[PDB]
Motif scaffolding. Structure first.
Motif, PDB file in Angstrom:
ATOM      1  N   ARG A 197     126.602  42.885  21.410  1.00 42.98           N
ATOM      2  CA  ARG A 197     125.299  43.556  21.326  1.00 42.98           C
ATOM      3  C   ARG A 197     125.352  45.089  21.286  1.00 42.98           C
ATOM      4  O   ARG A 197     126.288  45.700  21.801  1.00 42.98           O
ATOM      5  CB  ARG A 197     124.394  43.099  22.475  1.00 42.98           C
ATOM      6  N   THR A 198     124.337  45.697  20.674  1.00 44.53           N
ATOM      7  CA  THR A 198     124.188  47.157  20.639  1.00 44.53           C
ATOM      8  C   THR A 198     123.806  47.759  21.997  1.00 44.53           C
ATOM      9  O   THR A 198     123.033  47.169  22.752  1.00 44.53           O
ATOM     10  CB  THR A 198     123.150  47.590  19.588  1.00 44.53           C
ATOM     11  N   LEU A 225     121.196  39.993  24.030  1.00 47.00           N
ATOM     12  CA  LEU A 225     122.507  40.339  24.564  1.00 47.00           C
ATOM     13  C   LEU A 225     123.585  39.553  23.828  1.00 47.00           C
ATOM     14  O   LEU A 225     123.329  38.464  23.319  1.00 47.00           O
ATOM     15  CB  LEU A 225     122.570  40.049  26.063  1.00 47.00           C
ATOM     16  N   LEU A 226     124.793  40.107  23.771  1.00 45.30           N
ATOM     17  CA  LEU A 226     125.892  39.450  23.074  1.00 45.30           C
ATOM     18  C   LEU A 226     126.256  38.127  23.741  1.00 45.30           C
ATOM     19  O   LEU A 226     126.293  38.027  24.967  1.00 45.30           O
ATOM     20  CB  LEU A 226     127.116  40.366  23.018  1.00 45.30           C
ATOM     21  N   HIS A 251     121.113  38.134  30.693  1.00 45.75           N
ATOM     22  CA  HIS A 251     122.350  37.465  30.307  1.00 45.75           C
ATOM     23  C   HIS A 251     122.865  36.586  31.436  1.00 45.75           C
ATOM     24  O   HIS A 251     123.373  35.489  31.203  1.00 45.75           O
ATOM     25  CB  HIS A 251     123.413  38.491  29.909  1.00 45.75           C
ATOM     26  N   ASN A 298     120.824  37.321  21.013  1.00 43.19           N
ATOM     27  CA  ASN A 298     120.369  38.442  20.202  1.00 43.19           C
ATOM     28  C   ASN A 298     119.977  39.626  21.078  1.00 43.19           C
ATOM     29  O   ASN A 298     120.297  40.773  20.766  1.00 43.19           O
ATOM     30  CB  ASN A 298     119.191  38.025  19.320  1.00 43.19           C
ATOM     31  N   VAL A 356     114.554  43.340  23.206  1.00 40.61           N
ATOM     32  CA  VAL A 356     115.270  42.669  24.280  1.00 40.61           C
ATOM     33  C   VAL A 356     114.293  41.913  25.166  1.00 40.61           C
ATOM     34  O   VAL A 356     114.558  40.782  25.575  1.00 40.61           O
ATOM     35  CB  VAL A 356     116.067  43.668  25.140  1.00 40.61           C
ATOM     36  N   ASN A 381     118.719  43.654  30.611  1.00 41.38           N
ATOM     37  CA  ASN A 381     119.348  42.781  29.631  1.00 41.38           C
ATOM     38  C   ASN A 381     120.530  42.034  30.226  1.00 41.38           C
ATOM     39  O   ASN A 381     120.745  40.869  29.922  1.00 41.38           O
ATOM     40  CB  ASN A 381     119.793  43.581  28.406  1.00 41.38           C
TER      41      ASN A 381
END
Lengths: 170, 258, 232, 49
Positions: free
Chosen positions: B86-87, B74-75, B102, B72, B47, B98
Motif C-alpha cells: 500500500r501507498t 492496506l496492503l 489491517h 486496497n 481508506v 489503517n
C-alpha cells in the motif's frame, strides 16, 4: 504424374543456377527424395562441382559418395530420385542432355530430370520443368511440378517481407 | 458528492455503533461512489471507505468482499502469495488507523485463505502471532485461553459489545476447519482412528454426533456412517491437470516478461 | 558485432534437418556459413551435423565438419564457416562447451538457435556470441551475448520466397509411434527417474544461489513429460 | 432413529412423514478430446519457449 518439390530443394536449385550463371558454366546436381506411388517427392538436392567435361561424365562419384555419406549422418537419408541442370537452349535444343537421363534411368527407371532457367526466372515467373523418357515417337515428356511446404515452413518463409509427429501421422 | 458520501459513511458507522445491522448494510449499498473524487480530495477518505466495506463484509457472512476492500485500504498478501504493498501518502494518524484496520482484517484475512503471515506485522507482539500459532495447533484449549487472556482487546462501547458475540462465532468456525482438513480421501476408515481424533474435540459423544454433524455441513464426506459395521467408508481429472498446466505457463510468462 | 541477418534458406534448412528424423524430443545441430567479417554477421547457408547427447556429454563428428566444409569451399568460397546452429528452442547447458569446439574452426564462434517449432511468431532465430563481462577482483566468466536478428534475403531468394508464398498471398514415423507406445508401456519407472532428476536440478540451482546444470536437468524432465503427453 | 429425530413418533406418525417426502422402507425405510490435445500442445509450446 507429379514431382513435388520442397522449399529447400527449389531455393537451392535457383540459387545454384544463378551462381552457375555468374560462373558462365552450366550447373548440375542430384535430387534426393522418395518415389511415392507414381508421384515423386523431391525433399532436397545437392550441387555437383563444375567439370571441364560437358553433360555426361560430369558426375564425380567420389564427391557424391562422400556427400551422401555425410548427409546420412544427417537426418534425411533419401534416395537419389533424379538430377537437375540449368540449360539455356530452348526449346529442347540439346540432344546430349537426354543421354545423361538414360544413364539415370538405367540405374533407376523412375528417375526424373529437372531443368531450370536462372536467367528467365523472374519475380512471378519461375522457369522450370521436369522430364522423363518415353518407354516416329518422341523421346521424352514433361510432368508438372507442384510444391509441398509444411505449416512450419510457411511461417518461416513469411519472415521475408514480414511487415514432425503430424507429418508422420499424415 | 464525495462529502455527501463521507457523511453517509460516518452516519452509517454511527448507526452501527448504536444502530441495527440491516439499515447500515443498506446505507453501505447506496454508499459506494467513484474512487477518483476521493483520491483527489484526500488519501484517508478512501481508506475509511475501505474500512467501512470491510466492516460490512464482517457483518456479512462472506469474508471475501471485506478482504478486497481492506487490502486496497492496506496492503495484503495476494492470491499466488505475492505481497501487496500500500501507498504511504495518507496522513500518519490516518495510516495508524489503517494499521488498526489491517489488524482487524487479519480476522477476516485468516478466513479468506492462508497461512502464517505477520511479516508486515511486528514480530514481537504475541497478540496476533500467538493466535496464529493456536489456529495452527488445531487445539481449542490454547485458542480458548487466547481469548481469555486478551479479553481486553475484544471489549474495546461496552454495551455495544456486551457479549463478545463475533469472536466466539469466529472461533467456533475455526475449530471445525482442521477435521475437514483430513478431508476423507479414504474409502473405508476404522472407527477407532476417528474416535481418537474426535476425542480431542471437547464433546466425547460428538463423533457419534460430531462426525454425523460434519456430514450435514458437507465440508467433509462420510460413507457408511451409522452402519451396523460401524466403519466409515470414504474428464474431471483431465480438467484439473489442464488447470495446473495453465498456472505453470502463467508463472513462466511473468518470469519472461520480468 | 551489433547484429545478425539470416537468409530464409537457413531457416528452411534447419527445419528440414529437424523434420527428417521426426523427433520432437530430439534437438538437431549443424554448421552455419556466411560472413562474419563486419559488425553485421550475415548468415547465408548451413549444413547438418551428426550429433548425439549423452548425459552432460555430447559428441560431435570433427571429421564430418572438416570433410563437408571442404566440399562447401569447392562450391563457394565466399560462404565461410562462421558458427553453428541448433533447434533449441532455448540455450542448453552444454552450449558454451560445444561453442568452444566450433571456435577451433573459426573465431569468434557464433550460435544461431532456430526454433523450428516456431512457438513465437516474431523470431524463428536467436543469436549469441560468447563473451565475458568479467568481475573485478575475480577471474572473468564466460557467457553468451544476445545479438539482434533480422531475416533478410538477396534478390534470388526474395524472388524464390515470393514465388513460394504466392498462393497464400511414413515407416519412420510409424517406428517413432511404436517407440512412443513402448515408452508409455514403461513410463511408471521413467516418471520416478524424472521425479528424481527434477529434484536434482533444484539442488543445483540452490548451490548456485551447478545452477545451470540443475536448470538443464529440470528442463529435460519437463521435456520428457511433454513427449509422454504428446504420445498419449 | 428417524422417529426419534422427529420427536419420538409412533410408527403411524412416522409413516405420515415418510409418505410426505416419498421415503420407503427397504431392508428399513427406503430414503435414497481434440480440444484437450490442442491445449496440451499450446502448454508444451509455452514451456519450451
Amino acid at each position: 504424374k507429379q514431382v513435388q518439390i520442397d522449399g529447400l530443394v527449389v531455393l537451392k536449385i535457383i540459387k545454384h543456377y544463378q551462381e552457375e550463371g555468374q560462373g558462365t558454366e552450366v550447373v548440375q546436381g542430384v535430387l534426393l527424395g522418395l518415389v511415392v506411388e507414381d508421384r515423386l517427392e523431391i525433399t532436397n538436392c545437392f550441387p555437383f562441382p563444375q567439370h571441364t567435361e560437358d553433360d555426361a561424365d560430369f558426375d564425380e562419384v567420389q564427391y557424391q559418395m562422400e556427400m551422401m555419406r555425410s548427409l546420412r549422418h544427417v537426418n534425411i537419408d533419401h534416395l537419389h530420385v533424379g538430377w537437375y541442370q540449368s540449360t539455356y537452349y530452348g526449346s529442347f535444343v540439346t540432344r546430349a542432355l537426354l543421354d545423361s537421363q538414360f544413364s539415370y534411368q538405367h540405374a533407376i527407371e523412375e528417375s526424373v530430370v529437372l531443368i531450370y532457367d536462372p536467367i528467365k526466372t523472374a519475380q512471378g515467373s519461375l522457369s522450370l520443368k521436369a522430364y522423363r523418357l518415353t518407354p516416329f515417337e518422341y523421346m521424352f515428356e514433361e510432368v508438372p511440378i507442384v510444391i509441398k511446404n509444411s505449416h512450419l515452413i510457411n511461417v518461416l518463409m513469411w519472415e521475408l517481407e514480414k511487415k514432425x509427429x503430424x507429418x508422420x501421422x499424415x | 458528492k464525495m462529502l455527501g458520501y463521507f457523511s453517509l459513511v460516518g452516519l452509517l458507522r454511527l448507526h452501527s455503533l448504536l444502530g441495527d445491522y440491516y439499515q447500515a448494510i443498506k446505507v453501505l449499498e447506496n454508499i459506494e461512489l467513484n474512487k477518483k473524487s476521493m483520491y483527489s480530495r484526500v488519501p484517508e477518505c478512501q481508506v475509511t471507505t475501505y474500512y467501512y466495506v470491510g466492516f460490512a463484509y464482517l457483518m456479512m457472512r462472506r469474508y471475501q468482499d471485506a478482504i478486497r476492500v481492506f487490502a486496497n485500504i492496506l496492503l495484503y498478501i495476494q492470491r499466488t502469495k505475492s505481497m501487496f504493498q500500500r501507498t504511504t501518502y495518507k496522513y500518519e494518524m490516518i495510516n495508524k488507523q489503517n494499521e488498526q484496520m489491517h489488524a482487524l482484517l487479519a480476522i477476516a484475512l485468516t478466513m479468506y485463505p492462508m497461512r502464517i503471515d505477520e511479516s508486515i506485522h511486528l514480530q514481537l507482539r504475541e497478540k496476533y502471532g500467538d493466535k496464529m500459532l493456536r489456529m495452527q495447533k488445531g487445539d481449542p484449549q490454547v485458542y480458548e485461553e487466547l481469548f481469555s487472556y486478551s479479553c481486553p482487546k475484544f471489549l474495546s462501547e461496552p454495551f455495544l459489545q456486551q457479549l463478545k458475540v463475533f469472536s466466539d462465532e469466529v472461533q467456533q468456525q475455526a475449530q471445525l476447519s482442521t477435521i475437514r482438513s483430513f478431508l476423507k480421501l479414504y474409502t473405508t476408515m476404522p472407527v477407532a482412528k476417528l474416535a481418537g481424533f474426535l476425542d480431542l474435540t471437547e464433546q466425547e459423544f460428538r463423533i457419534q454426533l460430531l462426525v454425523f454433524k460434519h456430514k450435514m455441513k458437507n465440508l467433509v464426506w462420510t460413507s457408511g456412517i451409522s452402519a451396523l459395521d460401524g466403519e466409515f467408508q470414504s474428464x474431471x481429472x483431465x480438467x484439473x491437470x489442464x488447470x495446473x498446466x495453465x498456472x505453470x505457463x502463467x508463472x513462466x510468462x511473468x518470469x519472461x516478461x520480468x | 558485432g551489433r547484429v545478425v541477418r539470416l537468409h530464409p534458406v537457413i531457416l528452411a534448412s534447419i527445419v528440414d534437418s529437424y523434420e527428417r528424423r521426426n523427433e520432437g524430443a530430439a534437438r538437431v545441430i549443424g554448421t552455419l556459413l556466411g560472413t562474419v567479417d563486419k559488425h553485421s554477421v550475415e548468415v547465408t547457408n548451413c549444413f547438418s551435423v551428426p550429433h548425439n547427447e549423452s548425459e552432460d556429454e555430447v559428441a560431435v563428428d570433427m571429421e564430418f565438419a572438416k570433410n563437408m566444409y571442404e566440399l562447401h569451399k569447392k562450391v563457394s568460397p565466399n560462404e565461410l564457416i562462421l558458427g553453428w546452429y541448433a533447434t533449441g528452442h532455448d540455450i542448453t547447458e552444454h552450449s558454451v562447451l560445444i561453442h568452444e569446439y566450433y571456435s577451433r574452426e573459426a573465431p569468434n564462434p557464433i550460435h544461431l538457435t532456430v526454433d523450428t517449432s516456431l512457438q513465437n511468431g516474431r523470431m524463428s532465430i536467436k543469436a549469441y556470441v560468447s563473451t565475458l563481462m568479467g568481475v573485478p577482483g575475480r577471474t572473468m566468466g564466460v557467457m553468451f551475448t544476445p545479438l539482434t536478428v533480422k531475416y533478410a534475403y538477396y534478390d534470388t531468394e526474395r524472388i524464390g520466397v515470393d514465388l513460394i508464398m504466392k498462393t497464400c498471398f511414413x515407416x519412420x514415423x510409424x517406428x517413432x509411434x511404436x517407440x512412443x507406445x513402448x515408452x508409455x508401456x514403461x513410463x511408471x519407472x521413467x516418471x520416478x527417474x524424472x521425479x528424481x532428476x527434477x529434484x536434482x536440478x533444484x539442488x543445483x540451482x540452490x548451490x548456485x544461489x551447478x545452477x545451470x546444470x540443475x536448470x538443464x536437468x529440470x528442463x529435460x524432465x519437463x521435456x520428457x513429460x511433454x513427449x509422454x503427453x504428446x504420445x498419449x | 432413529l428417524l422417529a426419534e429425530m422427529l420427536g419420538d413418533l409412533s410408527d403411524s406418525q412416522l409413516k405420515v412423514w415418510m409418505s410426505k417426502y416419498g421415503w420407503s422402507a427397504d431392508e428399513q425405510i427406503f430414503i435414497c478430446x481434440x480440444x484437450x490435445x490442442x491445449x496440451x500442445x499450446x502448454x508444451x509450446x509455452x514451456x519450451x519457449x
